[model samples]
Target: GAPATVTEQGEDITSKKDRGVLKIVKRVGNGEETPMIGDKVYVHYKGKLSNGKKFDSSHDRNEPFVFSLGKGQVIKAWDIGVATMKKGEICHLLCKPEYAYGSAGSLPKIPSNATLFFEIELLDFKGE
Candidate 1:
């Protein structure tokens, strides 16, 4: 069967709070044990739902995602997850609804209360 499609649009918070999902996963990293705010980092990730449904992935797209931590460029879960990681480290991040798309949720695939799993690899940190 084909993999499920995930939207890249923004998610709402109201519906997410009603769902009551929280992240519960172990994490790993190299170099420093923690990431500071506003650090640019490179990462490879695979995201899936509780049903083992793949929603999004840098591996699937054959591309890497790069962003500065705590910049609000991505979701709150990503901000928190990446902040907890270090360079050359890989970790599994279980994102809760409060940490992810709340209430309204992302369109199409992600429903209310959807828990997301992300296997993230911290490639590098662009120090400011």
Candidate 2:
């Protein structure tokens, strides 16, 4: 599947209305709380290439990842995209290369300028 596009000439993931950085597969919000900067977010996620080849998964490791929102700890796409999710929600983020690893992709696994897909579940969060 193609990633989110900013073009106005297609029937794409326009559900979110924004088209520059992230694309939403499905939305989830309990009308409660979403992620914010400095919040410790715990999630289970799987990373993949656009060809549907699996690159990485927290499930395989049997442990979720923890990171602070809006931090530079991860890719820019993730910081922006994951912040759009609510607690206990699942989503697929079709990330563009610019939003992802950019011209210099992550070494060892991710290729240069590769578009990445992520299936992420917002398991929980701490810190208020």
Candidate 3:
């Protein structure tokens, strides 16, 4: 008998891309007011590699990334970007190397000291 296999439950790049493109049809958010730490927010986003390869996207999954503004649960760029957005707005975030993966970057696609790009949508906010 073959060994038991483990299957991860998540969309692949192709599926995620499909999802993000679909959400582009809706209204985009441009969060004008920056969010503060402990502020809960609803957002949609797509993350891609520097070579145009997509890694993940909440839009593609037909779901929004909801979390506190500065709870230390996300990357530094995300912390800064989300803080600068307002509800019901969308914006394209281009994170520099310093703001993204620093000297030691994530293995594989993301190289050392790499920058990142993201299209973010701010849906709502709940004060902490």
Indicate the worst ten consecutive residues by lDDT in candidate 3: 1-10
Give the candidate order by descending lDDT. Answer: 2, 1, 3
Q: What tens digits encode model 2's per-residue C-alpha lDDT throughout 64-93?
A: 999998888888777877777788787777
Error of 1 at 10 (Å): 27
Per-residue C-alpha lDDT of model 1 across residues 1-128, encoded as one tens digit per residue: 11122122212222345322223223455655566788777889887777877888898888789888888887777887677666777766656676777776797778887667677888787768
Shift of residue 37 alpha carbon in model 2, Å: 0.7
Candidate 3 structure quality by residue, lDDT tens digits, 1-128: 00001012222122223311111213444534656779888888877766777877897788888888777677766776667666776666655566667787877767877656677788888786
List residue ranges in candidate 3 displaced over 4 A.
Answer: 1-34
Best by TM-score: 2
Provide the lowest-lDDT 10-residue window in model 1: 1-10
Q: Which of the numbered candidates is closest to the native, going by highest lDDT?
A: 2
lDDT score of model 2? 0.74
In candidate 1, stretches whose alpha carbon ends up further than 4 angstroms from where it belongs are: 1-28
Instruction: Indicate the residue-level lDDT of 36 in model 3.
Output: 70
lDDT of 1 at 122: 81
